[PDB]
Amino acid sequence: TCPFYKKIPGTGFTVDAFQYGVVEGCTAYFLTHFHSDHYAGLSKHFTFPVYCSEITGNLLKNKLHVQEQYIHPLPLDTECIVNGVKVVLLDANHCPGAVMILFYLPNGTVILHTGDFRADPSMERSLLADQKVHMLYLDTTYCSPEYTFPSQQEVIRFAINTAFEAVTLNPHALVVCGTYSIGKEKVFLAIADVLGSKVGMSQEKYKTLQCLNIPEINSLITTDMCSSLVHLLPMMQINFKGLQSHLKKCGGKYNQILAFRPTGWTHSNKFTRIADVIPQTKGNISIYGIPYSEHSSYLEMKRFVQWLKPQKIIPTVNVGTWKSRSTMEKYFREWKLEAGY
């Protein structure tokens, strides 16, 4: 059955609720972003209205084959009316096409659903700033003070500098980047840009990236693996066996692999700095795990919530255990008291 935290009170709406069959009294289904835990259940046989961003709509049509007559894309930062309720889609700073949703209830209640997000001070100057928000449905993935990570900018500088050094020392080294979903495209695009190369990948991945409205994408990506010295592979293949196998398939064009896994967090963050990250190495293969997050750190989340000052907070992640629920509630109370309420 559909959990309470995917239901929007006083409306016919659900959010990211496609795996529960037909939901009782749901007149419109919202999808915040194209990640499988959120879209699970959608297909060509879905015949209810789906509301989403333009990019999410492109992916629904082309990857899942949802019929166009049931896809309702909305522009960002624009007041729209859906089944008689005013809504706004805001950029979530997660993966391409990911949104937060503002709902203005007929009775005057205002609700923000963050979907998945990485909180940023730039959000403090969107349409959020223009009215009080009463209820917040919050992405609490990393809601604990141990979750510190660097900026995306610092992590990308590290990856660019590491790749440029390696390939300048050895022109016969291949760079490989792991992927298993949309998001974190900057990792492989910034590396390819510093090496003067296109990124090579499967036909299926190339199709996915063509759905994203990235400027000048025909200029950065390719299915011609032979022309490219940055290759994308499934995340499952980023290990010594998988990479040894790939190197054999390149026909003696390359004699070394430098590979990146762009993981969310790793307990190395609790001890170590970004400058101090080191690879796992075996023979002519090195694997770097880099802390590229598309979710809020604890401090970023805290700042957003103390700025917004909602009346009620409803977590949407880590809700399955009493210990996690209790821990999150205690942090919310701390944040409230520190702000003076």
Ligand X SMILES: CC(=O)Nc1ccc(Nc2ccccc2)cc1
- Provide the binding-site residues for ligand X, judged by CB under 6 A: 305-306, 309-313, 329, 332-333, 335-336, 339, 341
Q: Does 139 bind Ni ion (CB under 5 A)?
A: no
Residue 96 or 200: the one with the smaller Cβ distance to Ni ion is 96
Name the minimum Å distance from CB 309 to ligand X.
4
Name the minimum Å distance from CB 302 to ligand X.
8
**339: alpha, beta or left? (left if phi > 0; alpha if psi -120 to 50):** alpha
CA distance 325 to 21: 27
Name the minimum Å distance from CB 308 to ligand X.
8
Name the minimum Å distance from CB 136 to Ni ion.
18
Residue 182 or 232: the one with the smaller Cβ distance to Ni ion is 182
Residue 34 or 137: the one with the smaller Cβ distance to ligand X is 137
Burial class (CB in 10 A: 0-12, 13-18, 19+), 204: exposed
Full strand arrangement of the beta sheet holding 285-289: 221-222, 199-200, 230-234, 173-179, 256-261, 285-289, 280-282
Burial class (CB in 10 A: 0-12, 13-18, 19+), 150: buried
Rule CB under 5 A: choose which of 16, 116, 139, 185 binds Ni ion: 116
Residue 150 or 315: the one with the smaller Cβ distance to ligand X is 315
CA distance 110 to 129: 12
Name the minimum Å distance from CB 316 to Ni ion.
11
Full strand arrangement of the beta sheet holding 99-104: 80-82, 85-91, 99-104, 110-113, 135-138, 312-315
Question: Which partner in Ni ion, ligand X, none is near 85 (CB below 5 to 8 A by kind)?
Answer: none
Question: Which partner in Ni ion, ligand X, none is near 341 (CB below 5 to 8 A by kind)?
Answer: ligand X
Rule CB under 5 A: choose which of 6, 35, 184, 205 binds Ni ion: 35
Return residues touching Ni ion (CB under 5 A). 35, 116
